[PDB]
Design a protein around this ligand. Structure first.
Ligand code: NAG
Ligand code: NAG
Ligand code: ZN
Lengths: 98, 592
């Protein structure tokens, strides 16, 4: 948006790194220093979720990019997602491979 | 639990917020510059005020992290680049007084007029001082200007100096001169450490080597002006201040029609050759992009061709109509210029594209380090591009000059003389003005001997004598734009040194056999990757280390400057045989 698409957020500060396929939606103040934060922002108490300043005037490295990740799971359970099967025509009065 | 990681997190948050706030401020400034209106001006003012408030708040908050505990060098440098307060050190009353004095001086300098015709500074005075050749027609204007503006700015400048010294002392410095020289202060290893006091000793050493060339040039200019000014020039004296082609004497380029080595072979101009081929602004920008890509630099962004205003708008928009390279951030690099099909604009396009490519280099560094090494690097990186693109070989390679043309000696001598009248003639003036301002700010020159010592330095350093006596009632230093409005002036000398240093360093790496002024960095990728090594660092490393990456030296070097004009130096030394190179500091046009 010309004015700015500030609807997309991103987490910048956190205690420790995440685990594979883990989600965190907490909005608690990042306790940086020893000072116990009391829900207010300021010195050593920063908000973890920041916003994107998406604007069309950006270059090629800061524009919004949509990323999809397709992960396949092949547990011992029977598979129910197979690829598209091919097909052919029929044959009459001739021994072929069916 | 250590303060290092806390400072790192604080700097990360500060950079994350700055990359948005400064971007919005630059966008508002660009919107104001495109269409100058009242609403856009108000929006730009509000954005600048918000950015300044955020920056001063973050600076006040960052002063609680002393650099002694920070072990990481880059984090310490980022904290040092922000802990500097500046004008906020003074109290509210002193800051208001300084701001009012600055605004009053700026208003007096901008609204100055000299009448006994009745004109102003830019409309009539500049054209007269540039083109007119009459003694009185220039003398009266010069005297009126330096008697009105000087006497109107003297009482304000006297308090301005004291307020700036108080601000410097409040900012843990000593004087305003040290605060201005603090930009060249480097920190690092034992070999990559530079001090503010060392610049005072190095500038004089670098100026001591350019003295014979400047003396020969001054003698040649005097001998050539003896014809047009028969009864106003001494054979062993200085030159008047109103006969230098400018109100102050900063650029001697206006003396080229009067001081020409060979008039029967004028300079090379590709204006008509560019008009015949049907070129335009976009063609000039495409040729500049091709030149910058041939040397081995990254390619220009797409938004540079869509969002940037390369040509003058025909929609009735009022632009300031002067070249500027804007770096809004996040991959936004634009050029605002009154570009035409002329040759000077053709070179200014490459000069600004150099600054743009510089901005496109240090973008990977943190926001607190997204700037050049010093004030002498950013403007010198772009100048070497214009110096290498204005050669007769590049014009023939691109197609502006036909192949049947051959390089002549007289044309090269005339070109070198015209370039020295603008590049070599300004260095003594800059050095003298900076030395005067340093000795005034440091309190070495009493307030009762400003004009006396100023004119004594004009006689000893620049070799300029006043045509009429001016006592301490005037203030001629304050008559300059850079002196009236708060701005640094030592950056020009360092820029002039570093541009020749970079030119020589990039020409010796490409194995070029010829004159230094006829170099051509085109079709040489090795000249780009060696330059980007300094362009990609910016302010993340001390300026000595960045300078060593290109030329190898960790300080200023004037030998490339003397090697650039070596044929011109020999020609001047051979032509000035029947004369005395120098000037005596006793002759006076006002005295009989
Ligand atoms: C610039 O401002 C003028 C003055 O109102 C207006 O006529 C013109 O349409 C504006 N141009 C743009 C591109 O906004
Ligand atoms: C660079 O090389 C190309 C191809 O050989 C040539 O057309 C062009 O004129 C060269 N440019 C210079 C400046 O030598
Ligand atoms: Zn400029």
């Amino acid at each position: 948006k010309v004015g700015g698409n500030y609807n997309y957020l991103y987490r910048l500060f956190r205690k420790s790194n995440l685990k594979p396929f883990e989600r965190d939606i907490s909005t608690e103040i990042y306790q940086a220093g020893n000072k116990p934060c009391n829900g207010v922002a300021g010195f050593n108490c920063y908000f973890p979720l920041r916003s994107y300043g998406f604007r069309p005037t950006y270059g090629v490295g800061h524009q919004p990019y949509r990323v999809v990740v397709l992960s396949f799971e092949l547990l011992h359970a029977p598979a129910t997602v197979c690829g598209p099967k091919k097909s052919t025509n029929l044959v009459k009065n001739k021994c072929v491979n069916f | 639990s250590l303060t290092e990681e806390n400072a790192k997190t604080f700097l990360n948050n500060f950079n994350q917020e700055a990359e948005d706030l400064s971007y919005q401020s630059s966008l508002a400034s660009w919107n104001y510059n495109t269409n100058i209106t009242e609403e856009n001006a108000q929006k730009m003012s509000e954005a600048a005020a918000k950015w300044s408030a955020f920056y001063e708040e973050q600076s006040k908050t960052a002063q609680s992290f002393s650099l002694q505990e920070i072990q990481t060098p880059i984090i310490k440098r980022q904290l040092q680049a922000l802990q500097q307060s500046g004008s906020s050190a003074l109290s509210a009353d002193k800051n208001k007084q300084l701001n009012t004095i600055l605004n009053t001086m700026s208003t007096i300098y901008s609204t100055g007029k000299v009448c006994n015709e009745c004109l102003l500074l830019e409309p009539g005075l500049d054209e007269i001082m540039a083109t007119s050749t009459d003694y009185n027609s220039r003398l009266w204007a010069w005297e009126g200007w330096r008697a009105e503006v000087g006497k109107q700015l003297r009482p304000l400048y006297e308090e301005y100096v004291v307020l700036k010294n108080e601000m410097a002392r409040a900012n843990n410095y000593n004087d305003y001169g040290d605060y201005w020289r603090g930009d060249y202060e480097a920190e690092g290893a034992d070999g990559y450490n530079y001090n503010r006091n060392q610049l005072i000793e190095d500038v004089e050493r670098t100026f001591a080597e350019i003295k014979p060339l400047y003396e020969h040039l001054h003698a040649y200019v005097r001998r050539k002006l003896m014809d047009t000014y028969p009864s106003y020039i001494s054979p062993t004296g200085c030159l008047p201040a109103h006969l230098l082609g400018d109100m102050w004497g900063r650029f001697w380029t206006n003396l080229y029609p009067l001081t020409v080595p060979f008039a029967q072979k004028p300079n090379i101009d590709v204006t008509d050759a560019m008009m015949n081929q049907g070129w335009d602004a976009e063609r000039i920008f495409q040729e500049a992009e091709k030149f910058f890509v041939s040397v081995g630099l990254p390619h220009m962004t797409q938004g540079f061709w869509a969002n940037s205003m390369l040509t003058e708008p025909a929609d009735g928009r009022k632009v300031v109509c002067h070249p500027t390279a804007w770096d809004l951030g996040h991959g936004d690099f634009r050029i605002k210029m009154c570009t035409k099909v002329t040759m000077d604009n053709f070179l200014t396009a490459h000069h600004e594209m150099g600054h743009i490519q510089y901005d496109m280099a240090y973008a990977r560094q943190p926001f607190l380090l997204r700037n050049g090494a010093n004030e002498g690097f950013h403007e010198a990186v772009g100048e070497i591009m214009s110096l290498s693109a204005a050669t007769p070989k590049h014009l023939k390679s691109i197609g502006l000059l036909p192949s049947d043309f051959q390089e002549d000696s007289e044309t090269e001598i005339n070109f070198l003389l015209k370039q020295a009248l603008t590049i070599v003639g300004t260095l003594p003036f800059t050095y003298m003005l900076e030395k005067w301002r340093w000795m005034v700010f440091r309190g070495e020159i009493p307030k009762e001997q400003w004009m006396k010592k100023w004119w004594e330095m004009k006689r000893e350093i620049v070799g300029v004598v006043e045509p009429l006596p001016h006592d301490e009632t005037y203030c001629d230093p304050a008559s300059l734009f850079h002196v009236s409005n708060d701005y640094s002036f030592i950056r020009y000398y360092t820029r002039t040194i570093y541009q020749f240093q970079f030119q020589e360093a990039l020409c010796q790496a490409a194995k070029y056999n010829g004159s230094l002024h006829k170099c051509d960095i085109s079709n040489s990728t090795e000249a780009g990757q060696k330059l980007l090594k300094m362009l990609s660092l910016g302010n993340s490393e001390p300026w000595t280390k960045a300078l060593e990456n290109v030329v190898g030296a960790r300080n200023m070097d004037v030998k490339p400057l003397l090697n650039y004009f070596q044929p011109l130096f020999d020609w001047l030394k051979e032509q000035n045989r029947n004369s005395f190179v120098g000037w005596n500091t006793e002759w006076s046009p006002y005295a009989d």
